[PDB]
Amino acid sequence: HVGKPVPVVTEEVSESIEELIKRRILAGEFDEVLRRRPDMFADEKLRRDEEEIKRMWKEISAKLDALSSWHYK
C-alpha cells in the first residue's frame, strides 16, 4: 500500500481525549500564549563602570540618530 491510512476515531479514542481535557483542566495547565507587558525594559567599581557605560551610550546613541537624520525608534 502507499502512505498512511487515516484512522477512524472511535468512542474510546474520543473519550480518552476527553480524559486528557479533564486532566489538563483539573490539573490546570494550558499552552495559551500569555500577554507580555510590551515595555518590559567591588560594587563601587561595578556601578562606576555601569554609569560610565550609560554616559557612553547616551553620547553614541545621540550621534547615531543624528547620522540617520532622526529615523530611529
Binding site: K63, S68, H71, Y72
Partner: protein, 179 residues
C-alpha cells in the same frame, strides 16, 4: 627617484616617499575611492564614529557577563546599529567587534544604496544623478551624496516628481502618460 641600486637600497631600506607607516596602508582612500566619498574629512569623520562605537562594544564586553546593563545595552546597541543598517545581524556583539567599519558606513550612504537598489548603474552615475537632483528620500529631494540611508528609508527612495529619468523609464517600458 630612479630604481635604487643594490648598495643604495640596502643603505636605504626604510625609505619610501610614497607609503609611510602613518598612512595606514592608504586604507583611507582605498575606501574613499571605492565608495565615491567626495571628501577625505568625511572618511575620517566616519572612522572616528566607528572607533567610538567599537570601543563601546569593547567596554560592553569588559563587564561581567551576567550583568543587566550588559544584557540591555547589547540589545540596544545591536538593534540600533542593525536597524540603522550597518550591521547585518543583531545576534552577535563580535559583529560589532570586527564588523562595524567605515566601509560599512560608506556603503550605507545614498549613491551606493541606490546602485544596490539599481536606481543607477554605478556609484558615479548615481552620484551625478543626486547632484543634479533627480532623487528623493521619502518626500524631500535629497541633493547630498553623503546622505546616510537607514534600513527602512531604503524603501522610500525613488525619483523626484518631474523627472526626465523617470520619463525615460516609463518611455523605455512603453508605458508613459503625459497626464
Amino acid at each position: 627617484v630612479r630604481k635604487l641600486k643594490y648598495h643604495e637600497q640596502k643603505l636605504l631600506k626604510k625609505h619610501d616617499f610614497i607609503n609611510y607607516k602613518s598612512d595606514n596602508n592608504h586604507r583611507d582612500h582605498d575606501v574613499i575611492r571605492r565608495y565615491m566619498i567626495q571628501k577625505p574629512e568625511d572618511y575620517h569623520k566616519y572612522n572616528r564614529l566607528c572607533g567610538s562605537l567599537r570601543q563601546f562594544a569593547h567596554r560592553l564586553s569588559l563587564l561581567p557577563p551576567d550583568n543587566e546593563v550588559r544584557r540591555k545595552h547589547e540589545t540596544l546597541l545591536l538593534d540600533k546599529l542593525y536597524d540603522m543598517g550597518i550591521l547585518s545581524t543583531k545576534a552577535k556583539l563580535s559583529a560589532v567587534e570586527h564588523n562595524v567599519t567605515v566601509s560599512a558606513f560608506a556603503r550605507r550612504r545614498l549613491p551606493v544604496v541606490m546602485t544596490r537598489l539599481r536606481m543607477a548603474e554605478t556609484v558615479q552615475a548615481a552620484t551625478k544623478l543626486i547632484e543634479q537632483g533627480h532623487v528623493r528620500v521619502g518626500v524631500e529631494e535629497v541633493r547630498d551624496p553623503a546622505f546616510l540611508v537607514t534600513r527602512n528609508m531604503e524603501d522610500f527612495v525613488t525619483w523626484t516628481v518631474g523627472s526626465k529619468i523617470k520619463q525615460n523609464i516609463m518611455k523605455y517600458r512603453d508605458k508613459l502618460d503625459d497626464f
